C-alpha cells in the first residue's frame, strides 16, 4: 500500500521522497523532524502523510505470487 501522491491537503508531489526519507532516517539516524525539514516539507500539511504512512506492500509481497 505504497506512499500516496499529491498531499490531500496541498497536493505537492509527495512519494518521490520516500526512498530519500527511508534511507536518510536509516544510515543517518536523524530524527524525523530534521529529516523532513531537510527533505524540504516546510508546511505540516504534507508532513502528516510521510509521518504516518505504513507501506503494507512489503508485508503483501511476502506471499509467493500466483
Amino acid at each position: 500500500m505504497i506512499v500516496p501522491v499529491r498531499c490531500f491537503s496541498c497536493g505537492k508531489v509527495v512519494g518521490d521522497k520516500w526512498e530519500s526519507y527511508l534511507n536518510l532516517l536509516q544510515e543517518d539516524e536523524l530524527d524525523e523532524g530534521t529529516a523532513l525539514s531537510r527533505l524540504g516539507l516546510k508546511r505540516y500539511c504534507c508532513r502528516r502523510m510521510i509521518l504516518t504512512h505504513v507501506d503494507l506492500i512489503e508485508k503483501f509481497l511476502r506471499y509467493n505470487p500466483l
Binding site: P4, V5, R6, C7, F8, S9, G11
Partner: protein, 49 residues
C-alpha cells in the same frame, strides 16, 4: 455543518482521501439426485430453460 453534518473537500476526495475497496463473493455448486441427474454450468440457449 449544521446539526452534526460536515463538509469535505472535493479535491481531497479526488486526490484519494477516504477511498475504499469493496468485495462481494458468491456461492454455487452442482446437485445430485441419483443416478446422477445433475445440473450443469453453461450458457443456456433462449429455447432451453
Amino acid at each position: 455543518n449544521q446539526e452534526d453534518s460536515m463538509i469535505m473537500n472535493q479535491s481531497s476526495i479526488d486526490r484519494g482521501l477516504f477511498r475504499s475497496l469493496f468485495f462481494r463473493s458468491y456461492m454455487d455448486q452442482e446437485k445430485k439426485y441419483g443416478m446422477s441427474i445433475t445440473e450443469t454450468f453453461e450458457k443456456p440457449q433462449r429455447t432451453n430453460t
